[PDB]
Design an enzyme around this catalytic site. Sequence first.
Site, PDB file in Angstrom:
ATOM      1  CG  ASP A 175      86.129   9.936  47.019  1.00  0.00           C
ATOM      2  OD1 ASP A 175      87.181  10.086  47.703  1.00  0.00           O
ATOM      3  OD2 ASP A 175      85.351  10.871  46.762  1.00  0.00           O
ATOM      4  CG  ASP A 196      90.279  12.329  49.485  1.00  0.00           C
ATOM      5  OD1 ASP A 196      89.657  11.448  48.837  1.00  0.00           O
ATOM      6  OD2 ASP A 196      90.070  13.560  49.345  1.00  0.00           O
TER       7      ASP A 196
HETATM    8  C1  LIG Z   1      91.673  11.101  41.664  1.00  0.00           C
HETATM    9  C2  LIG Z   1      92.114  11.344  40.212  1.00  0.00           C
HETATM   10  C3  LIG Z   1      92.864  12.692  40.060  1.00  0.00           C
HETATM   11  N1  LIG Z   1      92.156  13.850  40.655  1.00  0.00           N
HETATM   12  C4  LIG Z   1      90.923  14.370  39.967  1.00  0.00           C
HETATM   13  C5  LIG Z   1      91.215  14.865  38.528  1.00  0.00           C
HETATM   14  C6  LIG Z   1      92.337  15.934  38.477  1.00  0.00           C
HETATM   15  C7  LIG Z   1      92.688  14.471  41.742  1.00  0.00           C
HETATM   16  O1  LIG Z   1      93.807  14.192  42.238  1.00  0.00           O
HETATM   17  C8  LIG Z   1      91.945  15.504  42.516  1.00  0.00           C
HETATM   18  C9  LIG Z   1      92.553  16.773  42.747  1.00  0.00           C
HETATM   19  C10 LIG Z   1      91.955  17.741  43.575  1.00  0.00           C
HETATM   20  C11 LIG Z   1      92.659  19.110  43.800  1.00  0.00           C
HETATM   21  C12 LIG Z   1      90.685  17.452  44.202  1.00  0.00           C
HETATM   22  C13 LIG Z   1      90.056  16.175  43.956  1.00  0.00           C
HETATM   23  C14 LIG Z   1      88.737  15.867  44.551  1.00  0.00           C
HETATM   24  O2  LIG Z   1      87.942  16.790  44.721  1.00  0.00           O
HETATM   25  N2  LIG Z   1      88.483  14.600  44.840  1.00  0.00           N
HETATM   26  C15 LIG Z   1      87.191  14.123  45.373  1.00  0.00           C
HETATM   27  C16 LIG Z   1      86.760  12.903  44.518  1.00  0.00           C
HETATM   28  C17 LIG Z   1      86.854  13.166  43.007  1.00  0.00           C
HETATM   29  C18 LIG Z   1      87.623  12.285  42.200  1.00  0.00           C
HETATM   30  C19 LIG Z   1      87.670  12.536  40.804  1.00  0.00           C
HETATM   31  F1  LIG Z   1      88.347  11.754  40.044  1.00  0.00           F
HETATM   32  C20 LIG Z   1      87.039  13.619  40.186  1.00  0.00           C
HETATM   33  C21 LIG Z   1      86.327  14.505  41.031  1.00  0.00           C
HETATM   34  F2  LIG Z   1      85.752  15.581  40.492  1.00  0.00           F
HETATM   35  C22 LIG Z   1      86.200  14.293  42.422  1.00  0.00           C
HETATM   36  C23 LIG Z   1      87.221  13.801  46.881  1.00  0.00           C
HETATM   37  O3  LIG Z   1      85.935  13.283  47.278  1.00  0.00           O
HETATM   38  C24 LIG Z   1      87.478  15.058  47.735  1.00  0.00           C
HETATM   39  C25 LIG Z   1      86.334  16.110  47.527  1.00  0.00           C
HETATM   40  N3  LIG Z   1      86.302  17.161  48.563  1.00  0.00           N
HETATM   41  C26 LIG Z   1      86.139  18.458  48.190  1.00  0.00           C
HETATM   42  O4  LIG Z   1      86.020  18.844  47.029  1.00  0.00           O
HETATM   43  C27 LIG Z   1      86.115  19.508  49.238  1.00  0.00           C
HETATM   44  C28 LIG Z   1      84.869  19.925  49.810  1.00  0.00           C
HETATM   45  C29 LIG Z   1      84.855  20.931  50.817  1.00  0.00           C
HETATM   46  C30 LIG Z   1      86.099  21.491  51.239  1.00  0.00           C
HETATM   47  C31 LIG Z   1      87.354  21.082  50.668  1.00  0.00           C
HETATM   48  C32 LIG Z   1      87.366  20.077  49.659  1.00  0.00           C
HETATM   49  C33 LIG Z   1      86.414  16.621  49.961  1.00  0.00           C
HETATM   50  C34 LIG Z   1      87.713  15.751  50.089  1.00  0.00           C
HETATM   51  N4  LIG Z   1      87.625  14.613  49.143  1.00  0.00           N
HETATM   52  C35 LIG Z   1      90.683  15.210  43.102  1.00  0.00           C
END
Ligand SMILES: CCCN(CCC)C(=O)c1cc(C)cc(C(=O)N[C@@H](Cc2cc(F)cc(F)c2)[C@H](O)[C@H]2CN(C(=O)c3ccccc3)CCN2)c1
Length: 387
Positions: A37, A233
């Site tokens: 990540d 990301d």
């Molecule tokens: C990757 C597999 C598919 N999948 C997840 C399952 C659907 C998605 O496509 C998916 C869709 C969305 C919409 C969001 C995210 C997400 O939050 N990803 C994080 C890692 C992660 C991976 C996971 F598998 C499960 C998690 F719970 C977390 C990153 O570190 C973000 C977090 N950030 C913030 O939240 C933030 C903080 C402050 C402000 C803004 C944003 C900062 C940027 N980087 C993932």
Amino acid sequence: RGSFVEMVDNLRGKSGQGYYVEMTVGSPPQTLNILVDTGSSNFAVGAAPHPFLHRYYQRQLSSTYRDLRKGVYVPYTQGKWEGELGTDLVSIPHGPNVTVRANIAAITESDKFFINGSNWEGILGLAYAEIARPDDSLEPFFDSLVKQTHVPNLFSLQLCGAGFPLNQSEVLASVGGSMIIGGIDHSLYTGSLWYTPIRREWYYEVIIVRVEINGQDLKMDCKEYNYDKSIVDSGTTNLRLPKKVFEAAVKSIKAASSTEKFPDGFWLGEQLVCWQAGTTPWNIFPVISLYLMGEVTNQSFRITILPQQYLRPVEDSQDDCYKFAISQSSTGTVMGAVIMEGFYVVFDRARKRIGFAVSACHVHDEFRTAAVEGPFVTLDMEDCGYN
Ligand SMILES: CCCN(CCC)C(=O)c1cc(C)cc(C(=O)N[C@@H](Cc2cc(F)cc(F)c2)[C@H](O)[C@H]2CN(C(=O)c3ccccc3)CCN2)c1
């Protein structure tokens, strides 16, 4: 030539569930699969039973475990977890041949974090200390690795999309790509590497200066493309665009693909579209070019992605099915896994820059390929950055 053979092909997974690398924690070593990540900065592992985990970190079994006597709460956009901070010896079996003492958040409770069938049990936040939780005093893994060893302050990622669906057994047996720790493996890309400055060291923040859909300028004030930031990301599947940019991009992509009408649910990224086996009309969908700030004053370069990157393969039948992997954002542009699948991405922390080159594993057709091209003369690129 490719000079990091031990690390080539060390990733597995897919865009929709994340790409992961094998790691070991503790003494004796406990093997875990870890989500790569670049969008976060904490190293955290399941440390208690969970229905989606078939293994987890057992601190009581590690002779080198050290309790930091402190809790940590990490909320993400939708998923979250809470855990207990500690340190232990960590290694990467298909990585540098070093062992380091790193901070580890032992996940005790979570909600919509772990993914059923993903095969990973923790997360490796590769971004900067600024965004580490609870605060920037919690040294991220990569910072520990560089400080304790001779590993150069750089890593590179080649995420390999298959271009078709992988079932549970196939995704476990398939090579998902490479994470080269401390270097660049020249066998993972074609053409030249072009670098964009890392604007600030928190997320891997970059500046987009122009956007085209099939060569047609989206024609928005460039500040809109980076409102409120633009980041790379690997922990997010989709290309995410600021609301206004998303509305303009979808309108342009629809206009370019107008010979076929798709339902509203498709453009919202919710509903799949299917075509008879082998008949996906790639040619009707446009290429997308993102121009990035170059390292030279008044110079930019562009990365060009195909519908083979922005249409994510999903299983429905013998039909070839996909979801539209471009989403609206209220937190700036996110160059997610589907975009990174087109390129070999060099996270050159030492030189505060990110490199892009066409990936040797990008999905394409006989008529079009992804591209990384330059230079272009671009004025007032600093004005593209949001404050
Ligand atoms: C990757 C597999 C598919 N999948 C997840 C399952 C659907 C998605 O496509 C998916 C869709 C969305 C919409 C969001 C995210 C997400 O939050 N990803 C994080 C890692 C992660 C991976 C996971 F598998 C499960 C998690 F719970 C977390 C990153 O570190 C973000 C977090 N950030 C913030 O939240 C933030 C903080 C402050 C402000 C803004 C944003 C900062 C940027 N980087 C993932």
